[PDB]
Structure formats: structure tokens, C-alpha cells
């Protein structure tokens, strides 16, 4: 009975169905809909999901509940409520909020809990749905999809400051001081034509007090979509999200997010003549839920976000900044850390399809783990970002490794040689056409803060553009003093640069430093330099050909890597957890070995450097952090020195002249 006008929603029936779903939801239903019944758990599936969630909601005191719409699809009784939620966002969401409040108070009452209901009934609860279907992009959203839930994923380019939004006006009567407060309804404020008092009636007595109105947060976020599907010849499109209330200041530039919300359309005023609106409507998206964390990529580094989380907890933003690791998951992580072949296993788990790039994969793993992020009481900090250069013959799968790293890391930008530019990295001033105002925007390096910046075709870059990398690769900061901005910016990005030797192929006649052909101050900053070499080895060629041809045995086959690998979800979880909860400290024996090794290297070929000393420090710290050890030992330093020696192919180079012995350097 009593469906609302313009909708298919009946309040009573929808509330009944939502309460039914809340009472009797078990995760085994989602497992059935996922066709994952072989993974059905006896413990978690038995327990009632949302009832428990509402419980911990009551004790913790939060006011926002995050609902997975596919769970609604799982429950037979609420399959129709799913479509009702997609087609009618605002009504159904309000229905859900009222039902959540009702269920909270009912659950308190039924158990006769000592907890008072004063707070509960006064509080306002919000439901934030997500996982609402597919993406479909933005080129494919017809005007009939106005005011529907849509799912968008992309990169957050720019985030505007906080814009106050009026909620209650505060008109004041000049004559009799009749200060009436007018709430805004559907974005409209109605002025009292005269004084609302009967005794006093003066139309000119009204003069709105701007300062005493009550406002609300509003932030506009510029999101550039990265849709799963792209039509032919479609350049990337930018859409304007509009967050509200607690979600403000949650999404930072360079975050790769997946956002769900209401696809809206609003008339735009043709400012040529006031109060005249264009017939083409601007489209934007109201935001209801933001999912930054994903199990296919590493979680955001807590060290770089240590400063804001404590205040954000007070701010009540309540977004999933970090993924929660279960006790079983922690035990599994510790068990894997106890394995004897941990290092080789994690090496081959990254880029599983890449065959027989062992040292390269190990160095990439160490960079992903990173070094210890030291802090000085006096001031300053030494960051454990490892910068890796790849140089060698073409078709050695350098670009594939670059793409793998670019996929795994939480934040990263993949640039390629001539495409990049000095102002393009660092920062630039741009004119946001929407506000027609010069707005400050960040570049690829600052976007890749806290992650791995992948640079391909490094050699092709002009040395002019390369200059900005000098400060970034060492101080982990960029100090820009261009027109209008004079400041320093933090860019904690570990560079992963791939290049070719001069002549696009290695020349054994030339020395190593001539083949690489980079200024010494640059090459000094790189912690690891890889001479990936393509040499005609019959056994190696046969193995590689077999691997590829076997990759061409199905339409979407599985890796031909014979050895087992960690699935990328658990690998990302492991690497992240080791990043947050491990902070190695060097021991004295490691210090002595480091000093001895540094003297040994520091005794034409590539020269030793103090940066190489700090590089061994960082690499040993990273190797220890992989093993979950809280301290650095001698074997870690030995492994780091082995990696540095092997990456530059030091075991096959003549000391006086840097000619690589081609017969000697051969490896399967």
C-alpha cells in the first residue's frame, strides 16, 4: 500500500524488508552467490553479520554503517530492494537510516541493556552503500540515469578547499528584533516579505546576518576516471565528485579510489544575463562512500599518514584508511615469515609471469618493502626509499616489471621519457575552467608521494627535465620557488627508472659507465643499477620460449612458472603489514660489516660513494623488514652487498677497464 509518487517504493514494505535482511543475514549467503561454497567457514558464516556490526556500532558509538549492496542481492527477500536502492538513492537511503535507528533502539530495548537510550534516539545514523554493480564509465551514462547509484574508479587529481554550505539562514528584523531562522529546503531559502511578527510589520527590517548562519562542509574533488573498459579513441575524462560532511578532506591527490554515489545534473547559469540558465545541464556526482583500500594493491603507508590519522579519528570521517588484518591472517603471515625460502618466494611472487629475472625481482621486492623511516629529534628525517635503475638490452621485460610495480603500489604514476616534462613532474598552475580561477595542481612526482614512481625510457629524457630528479631522489622533497609559490614539497617517492644503453644495445667494448651514459651525480643517487643483459644461451632461450609458448596455450591461461607463488592479495597484505609493524634497527656487528664492505668497494669503472653506503644501510634494513625482524644482522648486510655487486655485474668486469667479460658474465 501507498507507493510514493514518481517511484516504486513503499515505505512500510521497504522498511519491513530491510529489517528482515538485517535480522537474518549470514555471510554464507554471499558465499553462495559468489559460488564460493567450498570456502564456507563454520564460524563467520554462522554468525549474524549486520547484527554483530550494529552491536560494535553501539559500543564504539559510530553513526555510519557501510552496506554492501551485493549482500542485499544475496538475500532473496530483499532482491527487489537492491533495484529499488539503485533506482531511488535518496528515498531508499533515508528509509535505511530510519530503519537503522529503529533497529538500534529495538536491540537495546529487547535485551534490556543498561546502556541509556538518550544518546541513541538523539543520534542520526547514516547508511553508506557500496559495491553497487559495475562501472560502465561516464561516456555510457545516458540522461535517463540521473539520480541513480553509480560506481566510479579513478585517480584523484585535485581537491578544492572546504566550501561552506548554508544550512540555516539568520534573517534579523531591524525594528522589533524578530530573528527568525530559516532552514534550507531543496536548496531554496524563502525570505519573509515583511516582519513575521504581527505587531511589527516592516519589510525593510530584514537584513541577513552572514556570520551567524550555520554552515556545513562541502568539498569538490576532481576525479579522472580509469574505467575498466574504454571505447575506441576516447581520451580520459574528468568528473567532479562532491563530498559532504565527514567525507571532506578524506581523499588526497594521487589516491586511486573507487567511489559510489548519486549521478546528479544541475542547470548552469549563463552569467551573461543573471538568472538565466543554460539548457545543457552540468553533470556531477554526489559521493556516499569511498573505498581507498583494495586487496590487489598495497595499503597506504601509515608512516606518511601518521600525522593526520589521530585528528581524523576526532573528525569522525570514518573511512577505511587501512585494511584490518585478522588474527588468522596475522598467524598466516608469521608462518610465512618462518619459511626458509621466504626471500626467493616473495621475489618470484612479484611479476609471476616474468621468467628468470631473479636479482631484478629481488631488488624490486626490497624497494617495495622500503627502508626504515628514521626521524631526528633535532630535526630532519632519513627516508628508506630505494631508487632503482634498469638498463640493458631491449626486450628484456623491463617495461613489464615497471607495469607490475605500477599496479602493485598504492600510489604511483607511470611516465615515459619524452612524455614527461620538468613542470609536469613537480607542480604547475592551471586554470580550472569551472571556477575560471587559477588553481594550483600537483605533478607526477608529488602525485606518486608515498609510492613508486615508474619512469620508462629514462635515457630519452632530456637532461633539462632530469634535473628535478636530483633533489627528489636524495632529500625526498622538492623545493619549488616559481612565480607565485615559494615553498618546499614532500615527495617521498622511490624512483624505478628503466633505460637502454646508448645505441639501444649493450656494447662490451665500451666501459659500463659509458654504456649507461648518465652524469655521475645522477647515477650516484641510484641505490641499485641493473645491467640486464640479453645473451644467446641455448638453454635459457629454450626455457623462455617454452614459457611463452605455454602462455599461448589457453585464451586466458595460468602462469607457466613451475614454482608456487603467493597470490597477490596475501602478498600485498604481507608487504603492507611488514611496512606498518616492522621498524628495523642496525646492530653493532652489522655496523662493522657495513664499514668493512664500504671500505672494500671504495678502493673508468663506476666509483664508490657515500650514497652507496647509505644504500647498503637501506637495503639491509629492507631485507630485515621483509623477515619481520626488529633488528638488522650481519647476513642482511651480506645479502645487500651481494645484490649491489650482482646488479652492476661486478663479478664479470675488469677493474682497470670496465669491459664486461661476455663469456664470463653468462648466466642461465
Amino acid at each position: 500500500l501507498r507507493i510514493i509518487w514518481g517511484t516504486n517504493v513503499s515505505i512500510q514494505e521497504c522498511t519491513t524488508n530491510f529489517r528482515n535482511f538485517l535480522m537474518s543475514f549470514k555471510y554464507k549467503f554471499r558465499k553462495i552467490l559468489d559460488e564460493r561454497e567450498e570456502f564456507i567457514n563454520n564460524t563467520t558464516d554462522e554468525e549474524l553479520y549486520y547484527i554483530k556490526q550494529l552491536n560494535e556500532m553501539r559500543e564504539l558509538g559510530t553513526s555510519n554503517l557501510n552496506l554492501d549492496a551485493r549482500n542485499l542481492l544475496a538475500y532473496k527477500q530483499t532482491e527487489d530492494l537492491y533495484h529499488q536502492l539503485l533506482n531511488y538513492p535518496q528515498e531508499v537511503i533515508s528509509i535505511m537510516d530510519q530503519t537503522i535507528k529503529d533497529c538500534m533502539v529495538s536491540l537495546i530495548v529487547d535485551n534490556n541493556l543498561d546502556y541509556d537510550l538518550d544518546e541513541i534516539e538523539t543520534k542520526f545514523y547514516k547508511v553508506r552503500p557500496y559495491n553497487v554493480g559495475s562501472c560502465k564509465g561516464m561516456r555510457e551514462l545516458n540522461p535517463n540515469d540521473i539520480d541513480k547509484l553509480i560506481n566510479l574508479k579513478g585517480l584523484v587529481l585535485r581537491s578544492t578547499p572546504v566550501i561552506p554550505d548554508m544550512k540555516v539562514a539568520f534573517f534579523k528584523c531591524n525594528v522589533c528584533d524578530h530573528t527568525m531562522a530559516v532552514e534550507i529546503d531543496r536548496g531554496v531559502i524563502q525570505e519573509p516579505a515583511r516582519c513575521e511578527r504581527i505587531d511589527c510589520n516592516e519589510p525593510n527590517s530584514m537584513s541577513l546576518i552572514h556570520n551567524r548562519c550555520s554552515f556545513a562542509d562541502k568539498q569538490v574533488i576532481k576525479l579522472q576516471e580509469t574505467p575498466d573498459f574504454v571505447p575506441d579513441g576516447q581520451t580520459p575524462h574528468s568528473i567532479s565528485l562532491c563530498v559532504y560532511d565527514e567525507l571532506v578532506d578524506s581523499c588526497r591527490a594521487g589516491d586511486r579510489i573507487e567511489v559510489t554515489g548519486t549521478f546528479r545534473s544541475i542547470p548552469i547559469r549563463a552569467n551573461s544575463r543573471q538568472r538565466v540558465l543554460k539548457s545543457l545541464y552540468k553533470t556531477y556526482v554526489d559521493v556516499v562512500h569511498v573505498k581507498k583500500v583494495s586487496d590487489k594493491r598495497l595499503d597506504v603507508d601509515t608512516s606518511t599518514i601518521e600525522q593526520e590519522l589521530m585528528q581524523n579519528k576526532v573528525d569522525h570521517n570514518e573511512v577505511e584508511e587501512v585494511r584490518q588484518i585478522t588474527d588468522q591472517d596475522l598467524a598466516k603471515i608469521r608462518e610465512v615469515a618462518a619459511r626458509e625460502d621466504l626471500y626467493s618466494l616473495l621475489a618470484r611472487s612479484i611479476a609471476p609471469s616474468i621468467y628468470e629475472l631473479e636479482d631484478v625481482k629481488k631488488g624490486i621486492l626490497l624497494q617495495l618493502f622500503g627502508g626504515t623511516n628514521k626521524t631526528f629529534t633535532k630535526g630532519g628525517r632519513y627516508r628508506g626509499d630505494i631508487n632503482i635503475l634498469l638498463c640493458g638490452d631491449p626486450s628484456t621485460s623491463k617495461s613489464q616489471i615497471l607495469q607490475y610495480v605500477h599496479k602493485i603500489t598504492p600510489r604511483g604514476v607511470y611516465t615515459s621519457g619524452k612524455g614527461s616534462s620538468a613542470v609536469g613532474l613537480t607542480a604547475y598552475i592551471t586554470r580550472d575552467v569551472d571556477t575560471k580561477q587559477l588553481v594550483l595542481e600537483s605533478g607526477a612526482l608529488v602525485l606518486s608521494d608515498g609510492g613508486v614512481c615508474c619512469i620508462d625510457e629514462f635515457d630519452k629524457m632530456s637532461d633539462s627535465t632530469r634535473s628535478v630528479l636530483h633533489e627528489v631522489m636524495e632529500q625526498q622533497t622538492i623545493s619549488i620557488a616559481k612565480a607565485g609559490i615559494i615553498t618546499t614539497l614532500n615527495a617521498r617517492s622511490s624512483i624505478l627508472a628503466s633505460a637502454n644503453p646508448i645505441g639501444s644495445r649493450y656494447n662490451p667494448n665500451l666501459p659500463v659507465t659509458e654504456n649507461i651514459d648518465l652524469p655521475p651525480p645522477l647515477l650516484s643517487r641510484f641505490d641499485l643499477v641493473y645491467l640486464v643483459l640479453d645473451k644467446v644461451d641455448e638453454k635459457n632461450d629454450r626455457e623462455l620460449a617454452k614459457h611463452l609458448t605455454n602462455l599461448y596455450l589457453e585464451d586466458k591461461p595460468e602462469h607457466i612458472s613451475q614454482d608456487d607463488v603467493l597470490p597477490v592479495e596475501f602478498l600485498t597484505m604481507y608487504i603492507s603489514y611488514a611496512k606498518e609493524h616492522i621498524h628495523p634497527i642496525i646492530t653493532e656487528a652489522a655496523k662493522t660489516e657495513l664499514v668493512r664492505a664500504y671500505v672494500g668497494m671504495r678502493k673508468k669503472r663506476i666509483t664508490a660513494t657515500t650514497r652507496q653506503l647509505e644504500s647498503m644501510i637501506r637495503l639491509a634494513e629492507a631485507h630485515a623488514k621483509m623477515k619481520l625482524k626488529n633488528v638488522v644482522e650481519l647476513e642482511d648486510v651480506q645479502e645487500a652487498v651481494r645484490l649491489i655487486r650482482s646488479a652492476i655485474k661486478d663479478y664479470a668486469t675488469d677493474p682497470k677497464t670496465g669491459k664486461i667479460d661476455m663469456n664470463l658474465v653468462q648466466t642461465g
Binding site: 500500500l1 501507498r2 507507493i3 510514493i4 509518487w5 514518481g6 516504486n8 513503499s10 515505505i11 529489517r19 535518496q90 528515498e91 533515508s94 537510516d97 530510519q98 535507528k101 529503529d102 533502539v105 529495538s106 530495548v109 529487547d110 534516539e121 538523539t122 542520526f124
Partner: peptide
């Protein structure tokens, strides 16, 4: 019918008040 009913909250949200005005008969469609 049964004689028992779920416990319900007292305060109705303003959005509920707005929705309750737009109410029409259910015979329109299903």
C-alpha cells in the same frame, strides 16, 4: 494478526516527514 510487533523508535527524521507527503495509492502499477 500475531499480537506481537517489533519495537520501533520514537523520533522520525525530517526526511521521513518530507517523504510522507508525497504518498499516493499503490494501484499505480505493482
Amino acid at each position: 494478526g500475531n499480537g506481537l510487533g517489533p519495537t520501533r523508535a520514537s523520533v522520525m527524521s525530517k526526511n521521513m516527514k518530507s517523504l510522507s507527503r508525497l504518498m499516493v495509492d499503490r494501484k499505480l502499477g505493482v
